[PDB]
Structures are given as C-alpha cells and as structure tokens.
Design a protein around this ligand. Structure first.
Ligand code: HEM
Length: 154
C-alpha cells in the first residue's frame, strides 16, 4: 500500500506532539497493551513478574524499554514508507529471538491508537486516526512479508 503525502502529514503532526514526552507515551502504551492483552507480558522476561498497573508505572526498566520502542517506531514513521533498511534488523530479532506473532503487532497498534486518541483528541480526529491506522497497517504488512522471508510468519 501507499499513503498520500496528506496522510503522512496527519501522522507526523500528531507524532510531533508525542515526541514532546517520549517516556510518558511509551509508558502509557505498554501499560495499555499489558492490561488489554496480558498474554503479551509473558514475552518480556524482564517484566513478566509485574502484577499490577502500579508496579508497571514504577518500573524503570519498563519505562526505558518504552522509550527504546517508541524511538524505533518514530524512526520508521519518519521514513514515510521508505523503511526497508529499518525493518530488516527489527523483523529478524522479533521473529527469531523474541518470537512475536503478527497478532501481537495488531494488539500494540490498537494500544497506540487508544493512547493517541486519549491524549491528543484535537490532533487525532477521524481523518488523523485513519491515516495512523493506514501507516501501522503498512508497517504490519511489510513486517509480515519479512517474517515469511526469515522463515517465521507468526
Ligand atoms: C511497532 C512495534 C514494535 C517496535 C518498533 C519494536 C521495537 C523494539 C526494539 C527497538 C527493541 C530493541 C532491540 C531488539 O531486540 O530488536 C525491541 C525489543 C523487544 N520487543 Fe519490540 N517492538 C515492537 C513490537 C513488539 C511487540 C508487539 C512485542 C511483544 C508483544 C515486542 C516484544 C519485544 C521483546 C520481548 C523485546 C526484548 C526485550 C528485552 O530487551 O529483553 N515488540 N522491540
């Protein structure tokens, strides 16, 4: 698929707001994911033991990983579709080392949309959400194709 420049602009406009607080957004998104789909927490050997949201909020390791994750995602979005180089190392580690099924990429896509909608209602109207969803679907389609080449396709 291909996004129009207009759609990329909507995506990068709300992303510019997200970047004013990378650690906070990273925290919110990971917590939303873990509460909504607890099974995903089991994939993180470092956080697997967290029992409550309060424990999640206080975890320095969780916050640090939220930043690492958001920074990588931001770098991909800023490529506006020309992200092949960025996707390679990411697809290899998630398919072969971490073993993350495509299903889980859809779950985090929902968490991202939920948090942006909660925190940025004025910059995340229906058109902006549609553009963001399209951007994430593009990302998922490409990662899925790479998974297949790598011999996984979760
Ligand atoms: C837009 C989606 C995603 C991006 C951009 C992303 C990015 C990253 C980055 C940059 C790291 C660091 C280095 C590496 O291991 O490659 C990482 C590690 C990891 N990711 Fe993701 N990730 C994504 C989705 C997911 C999902 C959906 C899950 C699980 C449900 C997941 C589980 C993990 C785990 C288990 C690690 C390693 C944690 C550790 O250091 O022990 N990732 N991810």
């Amino acid at each position: 698929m291909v996004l129009s420049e207009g759609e990329w602009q909507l995506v990068l406009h709300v992303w510019a707001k997200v970047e004013a607080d990378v650690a906070g957004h990273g925290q919110d998104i990971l917590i939303r994911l873990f509460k909504s789909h607890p099974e995903t927490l089991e994939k993180f050997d470092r956080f697997k033991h967290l029992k409550t949201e309060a424990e999640m909020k206080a975890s320095e390791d969780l916050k640090k990983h939220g930043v690492t994750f958001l920074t990588a995602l931001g770098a991909i979005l800023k490529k506006k579709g020309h992200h092949e180089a960025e996707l390679k190392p990411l697809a290899q580690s998630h398919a072969t080392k971490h073993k993350i099924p495509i299903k889980y990429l859809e779950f985090i896509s929902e968490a991202i949309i939920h948090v942006l909608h909660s925190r940025h209602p004025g910059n995340f109207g229906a058109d902006a959400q549609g553009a963001m969803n399209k951007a994430l679907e593009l990302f998922r389609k490409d990662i899925a194709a790479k998974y297949k080449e790598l011999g996984y396709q979760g």
